[PDB]
């Protein structure tokens, strides 16, 4: 289906190609009814209709014209999961440099523009000016400028002179940075020096300079111009038990960025003075930097009460991000859990499994067996039969168990002998009966322990449970040659 | 506790957690390591694509189980698409080549 996953920078044309509509207003929802906002964060035209194949407001209540968009609704007409894949984009009034490429240690923009992090932040937070191709004056290109350094220069070099600040200035610097030219220079600088420290300092700068030229990543893609917004479905707005909406943290972050961006557009309309729009663009810079990776800047923002709110990078990183919590480990259907007990009559390829857990874990196999015999007709009838638990479904259950292994698993699984596959033997009771020798593999005593059962659904998984993971097959520990089914 | 097929969570299409919420047991990370440690490959594929996440995959699975055909149509985890949307919502351009 697909080979390798490619990661690169996001161009503003690429972010406009992802998008389906500019998210303007910060207004989340109506909150007194049920409708959203047109056109706010949770829009209709920009994303899609809440209801499946329905104009949320009113037209198309059947399956004929899927797509029409009347002026009374300003709504698309597709599936309920269509909004989960669609993303919006916020037209940031003032340019804002990414926090992941400005504070990554080492910063991506720190060893690329040959400028110290301290000086980079100063200019970025409207606290220092930066020169950009001044002209016939006595000033460098990387050298910065202060209020006093600019004031005097302003009265001195009033003509051909450029000295901006913030991301805008930074962007220009990156934009006007001949990559190829630097390569040769850096390469020649490394071959014309003997300084150990310098050599390592020059080889680390030229490595990230030639790597950028090898790919299609531009230097001006570091600064965020067309901020992208995550799909609503992925930032869900559900109410808890009551009458209020427990709102997510990302909605606070996006709503603040949009509030500030609207304020900055209005101030650039009104021609406010310099210090007002510097504070306004600085608050937008800090708002974007707080949205992307919260708390990497000075003390993290907070909604309720003093606890900081969770941003996008905190949806990725950590013990509870997407990798360690939803992609490497998942919650799993056809699974069960109960307290273990001994049952020493067992043979060591089989374990006891209660009838109530067996009828719950094997509901689709019982449904298929019931539909094969001809006892019932529709699926509903079978679900009523096992909801009532009549006298005939226990023979069905002993005919779906028979040669179908299950994966028993003790909860701190340390090595591979902590997941072993057994054959069930049905138990009048509510406790998993586990063969005693196998306990020395699980480190399972019987002082209140619990184990999980998992069902191999498909046919290759039943064969893997019988041919690789069966408890008769694990009689030697894989760490050495010593038997693990030693009598305890 | 036992679960064949219950409710599913909203943001990542995986089953809910707990007993009061009719949920399924967490096939955690060390169990994924313990199935990599055997040669069990189809068991892990249905343990994290069919049984857990992929919605069209699990409706195809439920029809195939009640008709007697033990077979899985794999597809993609929907939570990986959530990872793509969260990385893509930054300035980062993650894709799927070919």
């Amino acid at each position: 289906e697909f080979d390798a996953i490619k990661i690169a920078l996001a161009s503003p044309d690429m972010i406009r190609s992802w998008s389906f509509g500019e998210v303007k207003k910060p207004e989340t929802i109506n909150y007194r009814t049920f409708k959203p906002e047109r056109d706010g964060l949770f829009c209709a035209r920009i994303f899609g209709p809440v209801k499946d194949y329905e104009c949320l407001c009113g037209k198309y209540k059947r399956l004929k014209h899927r797509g029409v968009i009347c002026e009374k609704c300003g709504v698309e007409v597709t599936q309920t999961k269509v909004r989960r894949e669609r993303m919006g984009h916020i037209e940031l009034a003032s340019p804002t440099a990414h926090i992941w490429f400005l504070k990554s240690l080492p910063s991506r923009i720190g060893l690329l523009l040959d400028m110290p992090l301290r000086d980079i932040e100063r200019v970025l937070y409207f606290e220092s000016y930066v020169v950009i191709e001044g002209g016939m004056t006595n000033l460098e290109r990387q050298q910065i400028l202060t209020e006093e350094q600019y004031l005097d220069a302003l009265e001195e070099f009033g003509d051909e002179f450029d000295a901006k600040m913030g991301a805008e200035a930074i962007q220009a610097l990156l934009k006007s940075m001949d990559l190829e030219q630097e390569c040769e220079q850096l390469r020649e600088e490394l071959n014309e020096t003997n300084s150990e420290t310098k050599r390592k300092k020059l080889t680390k700068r030229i490595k990230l300079l030639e790597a950028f030229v090898q790919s299609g990543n531009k230097p001006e893609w570091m600064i965020l111009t067309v901020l992208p917004v995550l799909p609503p479905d992925l930032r869900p707005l559900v109410p808890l038990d009551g009458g209020r909406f427990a709102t997510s943290d990302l909605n606070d972050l996006y709503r603040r960025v949009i509030n500030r961006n609207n304020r900055l557009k209005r101030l650039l309309d009104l021609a406010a003075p310099d210090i007002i729009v510097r504070n306004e663009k600085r608050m937008l810079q800090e708002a974007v930097d707080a949205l992307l990776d919260n708390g990497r800047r000075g003390r993290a923002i907070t909604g309720s009460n003093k606890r900081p709110l969770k941003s996008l990078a905190d949806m990725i990183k950590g013990k509870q991000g997407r990798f360690r919590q939803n992609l490497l480990g998942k919650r799993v259907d056809y699974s069960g859990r109960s307290v273990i007990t001994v049952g020493p009559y067992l043979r060591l390829h089989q374990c006891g499994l209660p009838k109530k857990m067996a009828l719950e874990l094997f509901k689709p196999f019982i449904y298929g067996k019931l539909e094969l015999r001809g006892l019932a007709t529709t699926i509903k009838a079978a679900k009523k039969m096992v909801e009532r638990e009549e006298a005939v479904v226990w023979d069905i259950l002993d005919e779906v168990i028979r040669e179908h292994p299950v994966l028993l698993n003790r909860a701190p699984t340390l090595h591979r002998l902590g997941i072993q596959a057994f054959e069930p033997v049905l138990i009048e009771g509510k406790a998993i009966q586990l063969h005693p020798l196998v306990c020395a593999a699980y480190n399972a005593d019987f002082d209140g322990d619990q184990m999980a059962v998992h069902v191999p659904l498909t046919l290759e998984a039943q064969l893997e449970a019988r041919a690789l993971m069966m408890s008769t097959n694990n009689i030697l520990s894989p760490a050495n040659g010593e038997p693990i089914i030693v009598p305890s | 506790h036992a679960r064949s097929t219950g409710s599913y969570s909203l943001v990542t299409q995986q089953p809910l957690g707990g007993k009061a919420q009719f949920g399924g047991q967490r096939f955690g990370e060390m169990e994924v390591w313990a199935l990599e440690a055997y040669g069990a490959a189809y068991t892990l594929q249905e343990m994290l694509t069919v049984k857990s996440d992929d919605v069209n995959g699990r409706t195809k699975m439920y029809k195939n189980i009640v008709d007697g055909n033990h077979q899985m149509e794999p597809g993609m985890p929907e939570s990986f698409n959530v990872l793509l949307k969260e990385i893509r919502s930054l300035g980062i351009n993650i894709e799927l080549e070919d």
């Binding site: 893997e464 690789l468 | 990599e36 055997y38 040669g39 069990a40 490959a41 189809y42 594929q45």
Partner: peptide, 16 residues
């Protein structure tokens, strides 16, 4: 690409 799936990845690596 280790266990039972090593034959599948042999097949996919062969058919490129």
């Amino acid at each position: 690409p280790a266990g039972t799936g090593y034959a599948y990845h042999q097949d996919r690596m062969r058919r490129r």
